[PDB]
Design a protein around this ligand. Structure first.
Ligand SMILES: NC(=O)C1=CN([C@@H]2O[C@H](COP(=O)(O)OP(=O)(O)OC[C@H]3O[C@@H](n4cnc5c(N)ncnc54)[C@H](OP(=O)(O)O)[C@@H]3O)[C@@H](O)[C@H]2O)C=CC1
Ligand SMILES: [Zn+2]
Lengths: 94, 207, 125, 114, 83, 342, 134
């Protein structure tokens, strides 16, 4: 989501961009502002749901000691789905 | 026997308690509150008038040849009216032991100096005067050591701010390293870390 | 020998501070209130002595919080109150003392929850 | 009341030492503007001496006065010798700090401070 | 020029303020009836020496220290303020 | 009034003032004091430059992080000026040479470059513009510098009204080209002076006063369409001024008269110099025309600055020229200069 | 308009219903060119010809002492009296009471979350209203 403002500046995933009259646009003259193009919101949205069989499962990142602490998510609700606090993966049961 | 905890003996404790009784009953005009800790570190506490006699005793006595000054500290405790707790760590080299002599002071109740006993105390007394503001009588030099020459303040006092009251930078108008007042681009972030739970009942203060 | 000094103990000519932070400044002597998140009370029990807060501002580069006073992060601790008044009168600070706030003792009863006549008969358990 | 002295039975015997110190400074200034090539006149150096003396004239405790005399002797040692440079001496004058406005309305126009 | 406010200052238990309490319970109702539009503030405290302020048109405030007074003399000095 | 323009702080470093400024002659003798006085209290200072990056290093300091932005420009290349003044409230013009070059003439320094910056500033929408002409600047003058400065002072007012035109006298500072210029006439065994220096009057001002005046002019609600005479006190006479210089600098004093035409010819042949020359015809003229009485213009005291007298600051700049045997000598051994009112 | 400061941004006194005077402490300074209220009034005064006597906060507190000395007494509730006098002085006037019921303005919780300036300019209180009314 690197849409620009009318002032030409890139906007960050923390929607930050300086106003037109904000004098702090000087520092980007003969220069640019570092912004990361790979937004984690859209990326983790570009990730499917991992269906499971149980009402309670666990989540680490996938490396074990290289991910995040083990947490358990309930999957009794059907209208919505589970979500991890550390990562943003989603789960559902059939 | 337990591995995680530190081993413990009793003979050092008994020896140091005996030597504490020794000093206490041999030097009663000055001595207060001899104490020996869990870790066996003897610790004698002294009236400020007793400094030269006690230090000369522990240096020159035969059963106490404490003829080496290791440290000479000070400790600011704003609560007590006599703020600065002054400390004298010593060692013997004849008995392979240490001792700690302590006195107290204030901003306007100075203490006799110790160069007449331990010449090592010269620069330490200078450091203590500079850092905490304790004047020492009949000292040869007694100027600053560590602070800048044009410096007002005794920094290691607890009522002194960590960042100070003046800041330096060079100016082209006068071509000198002028001293402007203090203005930081990021305030020091004080963290409130102490937990609201009695961790050690043994030190529980009653009301 | 001794001397008979009458006047108030004063030290400001020794401390090496400016006239500004001595005269302009105000001091709050107090026991801090317990954090209502934690049921613990050990962060109480010691009289502290804070200073008045002053202008902080956004640093124009990154947005950090800046200051022009060095007494901002200043906190002292005293076992009692008169010690704190003494330290402040000695160092030349005008002080405001907030008295000690102690919770009222209270009469608890696990049997009042199961009364025949009273309104303490809780509907739950 | 009922306290120990330092170097002074009373305040007059402290003012004695004060005047000795003022004397040493008055006699030292012309040598300090010469040895390290300060760009001031001897008149305003000595006026600075009297200013930094009258910065502490309210005091009446003899002990405080004796300690101030001690610190003045320290600074005089540092200045008689050249342990301190032109920077430290001209630090006294505040040749870069704009005057703190001693008026209400100016403070109100700039800042929340009293 | 003209009177705009009176305000009475006193204590509840200190005896030097005794005379103002009696004066109040005796004459305050009649005085308010005599001067209904006018206010007269009564603000008491634990330990304060009594006073009696009166404010005229500009910020012109004038006091009398009626500490350890009677009630009749309080009434007399108050009428002196009014007049 | 953007929130980033509000002045926060106790008026010092690492604070904010609201004085986002461009300083075009920043790489010089007066620009350094202007930038120092702008950074001392907290204010972003855009510094357009053409010099090497080596000659902007003393300016790299004197500002907290971010409050000093540099960017290169060319007076010949418009679209390098709007780049600078696009983001500012204030624009300060301190450009000026003491000699022509094969590339830049006097018109192309004192007329066309101010006019360009002023057009760009009126288009950008800045709130103030401080121009720096000369006290003696008049279209009816002998020097090309002064007449060009008159033309520019007029044309800047035409194109950018609500401007500010500061008119200083001969400024003196550590690296000036006035007191050091007089003092460097010792390598030659005598100092020439038209009419022996008499019939010439000089009212010189210290740099820091000029800088403080500019720095307050960019903050005062008044001083929006007004001229200023940054003169300094104590109108001196040129012979006695040079005598005070040569007394503070304890060398000698062998003056002698010299007509203006031969001294001008000397200035010309010294101006045949690919480097920064020493003397020039216009410098001679500007040295030998009296300062105007400022009695009909506001000055420093109407802007918040007490003029520092030259007898208070001369030693700082003239001790560089003293020899051993006279270096460690004080200000009170120089029999100060006779003054005039005229 | 003269921008003032909020309770979070000034040391001030607020008397509660009981009469207890309570002291705020400055936590965050006010933003922009906003300043304290009494500071503004004293500055306006100096701009005019009155130049009110006080110039700091302790002086204004002493003035509060002069007017009502109950206000510098922080956390010290004071025991008033003389209700009988008010009764005798209020029985005199005779104004009928209407045959009108008396409903309060804050009747439901809908009316509770927005009764102020800070409260009315707030997203959380508006959210609570949005929740209750839906
Ligand atoms: N004695 C004095 O200093 C007096 C000065 N003034 C006025 O003060 C102002 C500056 O004085 P001063 O600072 O002494 O001048 P300086 O010569 O000291 O510095 C002038 C600045 O102008 C810049 N400059 C010159 N020509 C050009 C150009 N063609 N294109 C781009 N930049 C250019 C230079 O930048 P670079 O070095 O990168 O070329 C230099 O930094 C002038 O307006 C002058 O009239 C008035 C009276 C006396
Ligand atoms: Zn996860």
């Amino acid at each position: 989501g690197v849409q620009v403002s009318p002032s030409g500046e890139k906007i960050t995933h923390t929607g930050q961009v300086y106003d037109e009259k904000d004098y702090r646009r000087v520092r980007f003259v003969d220069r640019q502002k570092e912004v990361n193009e790979n937004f984690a919101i859209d990326l983790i949205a570009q990730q499917p749901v991992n269906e499971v069989e149980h009402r309670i499962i666990a989540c680490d990142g996938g490396g074990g000691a290289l991910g995040h602490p083990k947490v358990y998510i309930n999957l009794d609700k059907e209208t919505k789905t589970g979500t991890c606090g550390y990562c943003g993966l989603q789960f559902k049961q059939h | 026997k337990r591995p995680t905890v530190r081993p413990r003996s009793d003979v050092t404790h008994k020896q140091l308690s005996a030597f504490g009784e020794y000093v206490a009953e041999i030097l009663p005009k000055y001595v207060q509150q001899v104490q020996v800790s869990c870790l066996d570190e003897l610790e004698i506490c002294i009236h400020p008038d007793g400094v030269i006699p006690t230090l000369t005793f522990l240096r020159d006595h035969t059963n106490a040849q404490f003829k080496s000054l290791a440290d000479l500290t000070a400790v600011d405790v704003p609560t007590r009216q006599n703020r600065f707790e002054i400390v004298y760590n010593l060692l013997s080299l004849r008995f392979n032991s240490r001792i700690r002599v302590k006195t107290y002071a204030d901003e306007l109740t100075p203490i006799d100096s110790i160069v007449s006993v331990h010449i090592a105390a010269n620069w330490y007394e200078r450091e203590v005067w500079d850092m905490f503001g304790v004047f020492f009588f009949n000292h040869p030099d007694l100027r600053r050591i560590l602070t800048d020459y044009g410096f007002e303040g005794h920094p290691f006092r607890k009522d002194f701010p960590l960042t100070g009251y003046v800041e330096l930078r060079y100016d082209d108008e006068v071509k000198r390293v002028v001293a402007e007042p203090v203005e930081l681009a990021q305030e020091f972030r004080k963290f409130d870390l102490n937990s609201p739970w009695e961790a050690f009942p043994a030190y529980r203060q009653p009301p | 020998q001794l001397i008979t000094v009458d006047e108030k103990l004063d030290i400001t000519t020794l401390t090496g501070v400016p006239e500004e932070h001595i005269k302009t400044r105000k001091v709050r002597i107090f026991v801090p209130a317990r954090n209502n998140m934690q049921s613990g009370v050990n962060n109480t029990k010691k009289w502290k002595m804070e200073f008045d807060t002053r202008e902080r501002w956004e640093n124009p580069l990154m947005g950090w919080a800046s200051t022009a006073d060095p007494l901002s992060n200043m906190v002292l601790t005293f076992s009692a109150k008169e010690d704190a008044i003494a330290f402040a009168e000695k160092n030349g600070w005008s002080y405001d003392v907030e008295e000690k706030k102690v919770p009222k003792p209270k009469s608890k009863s696990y049997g009042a929850n199961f009364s025949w006549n009273k309104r303490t008969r809780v509907s739950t358990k | 009341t009922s306290v120990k002295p330092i170097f002074s039975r009373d305040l007059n015997e402290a003012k004695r030492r004060v005047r000795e110190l003022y004397r040493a400074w008055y006699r030292e200034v012309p040598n300090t503007v010469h040895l390290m090539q300060l760009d001031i006149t001897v008149k305003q150096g000595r006026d600075k001496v009297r200013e930094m003396f009258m910065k502490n004239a309210h005091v009446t405790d003899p002990r405080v006065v004796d300690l101030l005399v001690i610190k003045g002797k320290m600074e005089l040692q540092e200045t008689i010798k050249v342990w301190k440079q032109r920077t430290h001496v001209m630090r006294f004058f505040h040749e870069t700090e704009t005057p703190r406005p001693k008026d209400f309305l100016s403070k109100f126009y700039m800042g929340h401070d009293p | 020029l003209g009177l705009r406010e009176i305000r009475v200052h006193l204590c509840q238990r200190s005896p030097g303020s005794q005379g103002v309490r009696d004066f109040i319970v005796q004459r305050y109702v009649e005085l308010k009836k005599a001067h209904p539009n006018l206010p007269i503030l009564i603000r008491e405290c634990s330990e304060v020496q009594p006073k009696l302020w009166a404010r005229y048109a500009f910020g012109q405030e004038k006091t009398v220290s009626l500490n350890n007074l009677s009630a009749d003399e309080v009434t007399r000095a108050m009428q002196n303020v009014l007049s | 009034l953007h929130h980033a323009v509000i002045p926060h702080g106790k008026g010092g470093r690492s604070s904010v003032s609201g004085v986002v400024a461009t300083v075009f002659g920043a790489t010089g003798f007066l620009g350094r004091y202007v930038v120092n006085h702008l950074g001392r209290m907290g204010s972003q200072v855009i510094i357009p430059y053409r010099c090497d990056v080596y000659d902007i290093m003393h300016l790299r300091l004197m500002g907290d992080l971010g409050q000093l932005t540099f960017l290169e420009w060319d007076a010949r290349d418009k679209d390098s000026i709007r780049k600078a003044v696009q983001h500012s409230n204030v624009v300060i013009n301190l450009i000026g040479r003491e000699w022509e070059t094969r590339n830049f003439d006097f018109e192309d320094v004192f007329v066309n470059i101010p006019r360009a910056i002023a057009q760009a500033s009126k288009e950008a929408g800045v709130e103030r513009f401080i121009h720096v002409s000369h006290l003696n600047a008049s279209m009816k003058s002998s020097s090309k510098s002064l007449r060009s400065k008159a033309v520019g002072e007029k044309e800047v007012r035409s194109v950018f009204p609500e401007a500010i035109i500061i008119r200083p006298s001969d400024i003196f500072g550590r690296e000036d080209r006035f007191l050091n210029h007089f003092a460097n006439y010792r390598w030659f065994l005598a100092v020439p002076l038209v009419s022996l220096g008499f019939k010439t009057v000089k009212q010189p001002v210290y740099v820091a006063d000029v800088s403080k005046g500019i720095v307050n002019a960019t903050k005062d609600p008044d001083a929006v369409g007004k001229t200023f005479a940054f003169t300094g006190p104590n109108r001196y006479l040129l012979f006695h001024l040079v005598k005070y210089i040569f007394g503070m600098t304890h060398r000698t004093f062998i003056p002698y008269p010299l007509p203006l035409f031969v001294y001008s010819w000397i200035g010309k042949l010294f101006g045949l110099s690919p480097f920064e020359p020493w003397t020039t015809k216009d410098k001679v003229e500007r040295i030998h025309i009296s300062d105007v009485m400022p009695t009909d213009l506001p000055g420093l005291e109407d802007l918040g600055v007490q003029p520092t007298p030259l007898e208070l600051k001369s030693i700082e700049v003239l001790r560089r020229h003293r020899t051993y045997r006279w270096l460690s000598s004080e200000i009170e051994e120089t029999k100060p200069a006779k003054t005039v009112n005229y | 308009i003269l921008p003032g400061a909020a309770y979070t941004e000034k040391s001030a006194t607020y008397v509660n219903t009981e009469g207890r005077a309570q002291q705020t402490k400055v936590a965050v300074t006010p933003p922009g060119l906003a300043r304290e209220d009494w500071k503004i009034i004293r500055a306006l005064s100096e701009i005019a010809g009155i130049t009110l006597p006080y110039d700091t906060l302790d002086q204004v507190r002493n003035r509060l002492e002069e007017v009502s000395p109950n206000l510098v007494r922080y956390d010290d509730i004071e025991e008033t009296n003389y209700f009988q006098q008010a009764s005798e002085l209020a029985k005199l006037v005779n104004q009928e009471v209407l045959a009108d019921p008396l409903v309060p303005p804050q009747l439901t919780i809908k009316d509770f979350y927005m009764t102020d300036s800070i409260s009315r300019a707030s997203q959380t209180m508006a959210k609570c209203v949005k929740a209750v009314t839906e």
